[PDB]
């Protein structure tokens, strides 16, 4: 199907760019939102009884401000999220009242019955603490990751290496049109491989999410022309992200990304991509692209020293 193909391409494109109001208006009922529609809007090219989305489904339709808050809780890392919470709390005591939360959520109302029942009681009184806040953070992130995992049809509770590589390359919204060839080659490169159990990809995704600190943690490798390595990646993931990584996952990431290199995975190869994609918070599809391409080409050409 060609027409449905271009429809899904345009939906994915409007998902990638111009998110805040255009997406929320693009998915609705009949001005509010529904949880399954939210899940549809957060997944590209596309009732629970145990999920968070079930709890919201029991609750009333989601608001636009709630949508913004959900985007931020999905986006920001853990430490920055703790800082954001500390900024949420206006009063001294470490508990966000319903009134101050209402103020800092109404501050987003620019185009001029919420998730409160999950944070507060039906009386809209029960104030929460930082512990419940981080618990909701972790629960929502693990839940969306579980949903994405199960969307890829698993075998024996496991996922082909090509599928994991495709999910990874889809996480960083970069269309190199050449890394897809590496994704395709990963299958034969890992002929009759393992199944990449959910815990391995979970650990790798939490590590990738906590990369803003990983970058500054290995800053000595930068400023020295150094390049990454298997053991060093193991170490930095164990120290900063505080989680283990199986050697197979590091192997498949190396095989996916270290294309120009010979197994070293320098800054421009892997870390820069994720560090830039984590900062998404800041025919027309030809001008800017061609300009950037030409700029890079001219820079590479002029790269002939003094």
């Amino acid at each position: 199907g060609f027409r449905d193909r271009k429809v899904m391409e345009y939906e994915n494109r409007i998902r990638a760019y111009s998110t805040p109001d255009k997406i929320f208006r693009y998915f609705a009922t009949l001005v509010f939102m529904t949880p399954e529609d939210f899940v549809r809007s957060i997944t590209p090219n596309e009732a629970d009884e145990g999920s968070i989305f079930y709890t919201l489904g029991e609750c009333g339709l989601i608001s636009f401000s709630d949508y913004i808050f959900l985007t931020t809780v999905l986006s920001t890392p853990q430490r920055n999220f703790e800082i954001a919470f500390k900024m949420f709390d206006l009063n001294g005591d470490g508990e966000v009242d319903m009134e101050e939360f209402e103020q800092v959520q109404s501050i987003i109302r620019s185009q001029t019955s919420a998730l409160t029942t999950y944070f507060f009681g039906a009386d809209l009184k029960g104030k929460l603490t930082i512990k419940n806040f981080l618990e909701f953070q972790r629960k929502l992130q693990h839940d969306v990751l579980k949903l994405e995992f199960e969307r890829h049809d698993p075998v024996d509770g496991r996922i082909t290496e090509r599928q994991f590589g495709g999910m990874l390359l889809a996480y960083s919204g970069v269309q190199s049109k050449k890394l897809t060839a590496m994704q395709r080659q990963l299958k034969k490169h890992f002929k009759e491989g393992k199944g990449l159990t959910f815990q391995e990809v979970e650990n790798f995704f939490t590590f990738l999410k906590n990369i803003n600190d990983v970058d500054t943690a290995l800053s000595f490798y930068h400023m020295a022309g150094a390049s990454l390595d298997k053991v060093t990646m193991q170490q930095v993931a164990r120290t900063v992200a505080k989680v283990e990584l199986s050697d197979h996952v590091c192997d498949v990431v190396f095989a996916l990304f270290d294309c120009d290199g010979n197994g070293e995975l320098s800054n421009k190869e892997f870390v820069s991509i994720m560090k830039q994609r984590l900062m998404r918070g800041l025919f027309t599809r030809l001008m800017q692209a061609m300009w950037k391409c030409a700029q890079e080409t001219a820079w590479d050409f002029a790269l002939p020293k003094q």
């Binding site: 190199s176 049109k177 050449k178 060839a181 395709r184 080659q185 391409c293 080409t297």
Partner: peptide
């Protein structure tokens, strides 16, 4: 063409 990541035959 292969350098600019435009056309890679596979």
């Amino acid at each position: 063409l292969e350098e600019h990541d435009i056309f890679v035959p596979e």
